[PDB]
Every structure is written in C-alpha cells, then in structure tokens.
A paper describes a structure:
However, unlike IL-4, they signal strictly through the type I complex, offering insights into the intertwined functions of the type I and type II complexes.
We first grafted 14 cytokine residues implicated in the hIL-4–hIL-4Rα interface onto Neo-2, while preserving Neo-2 residues implicated in the Neo-2–hγc interface. The resulting grafted hNeo-4 was then subjected to random mutagenesis and four rounds of selection using the yeast surface display platform to increase hIL-4Rα binding. Overall, 16 mutations were introduced into Neo-2 to derive hNeo-4; 1 of the 14 originally grafted mutations was modified by selection, and 2 more mutations were introduced during selection. Similar to previous reports, Kd values for hIL-4 binding to hIL-4Rα and the hIL-4Rα–hγc complex were 0.48 nM and 64 nM, respectively. hNeo-4 had a 121-fold weaker binding affinity toward hIL-4Rα (Kd = 58 nM) than hIL-4 due to a higher rate of dissociation (koff) and a slightly lower rate of association (kon). Interestingly, hNeo-4 had comparable affinity (Kd = 80 nM) for the hIL-4Rα–hγc complex to hIL-4. BLI binding studies confirmed that hNeo-4 did not interact with the type II complex.
Author numbering: 3 to 99
C-alpha cells in the first residue's frame, strides 16, 4: 500500500492551496475552495481504498477522517478552525512521504 505517493502529493498541494485561501482572503474564495476540496476528497477516497486493499486499516480510517476534516473546512465559518484542519491534514499526509 506504500506506493500512493502521487495521490498524496496531489492531496498535499490541494490542502496547501486551501490553507492559502483561508489565510490570504478574509472572506475566502468560496468557489475555489470548493474546487480544491472536491479534488482533495477524491484523492483521499482513493488513498483510503488502496490502504483497504493493502490490509492497512489503521491508515485507511486515518485517510477517511481527513475527508471528514476537509468537509468540515467547507462547512466551518471559523478561519482558525479551517487552519486547524488544514494543518492536521497536511501533517498526516506528510507521514506517508
């Protein structure tokens, strides 16, 4: 399951883009944030499936929760809550190289 590297790289770029949108804009570019969240969620659903196929359920639910965190970023009105989830998502994706 280890080779999921291009998917994690793309997911990291999307997460860092959202993080940049949240900080830069005071009222964020809501449609551009939705564009990156959709791509990110898609990438991590695949990462979760590859971990499931590789019998690595611990890293699979880890990937699943980061989808819920990205969905929270879409919902939440607090910029700091958006930052929190983005930094958490970023640090976990990095654990996967």
């Amino acid at each position: 399951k280890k080779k999921i590297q291009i998917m994690a790289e793309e997911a990291l770029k999307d997460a860092l883009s959202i993080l940049n949108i949240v900080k830069t804009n005071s009222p964020p570019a809501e449609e551009q944030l939705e564009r990156f969240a959709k791509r990110f969620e898609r990438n991590l659903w695949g990462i979760a499936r590859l971990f499931e196929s590789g019998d690595q359920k611990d890293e699979a639910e880890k990937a699943k929760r980061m989808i819920e965190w990205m969905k929270r970023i879409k919902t939440t009105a607090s910029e700091d809550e958006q930052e929190e989830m983005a930094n958490a998502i970023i640090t976990i994706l990095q654990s996967w190289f």
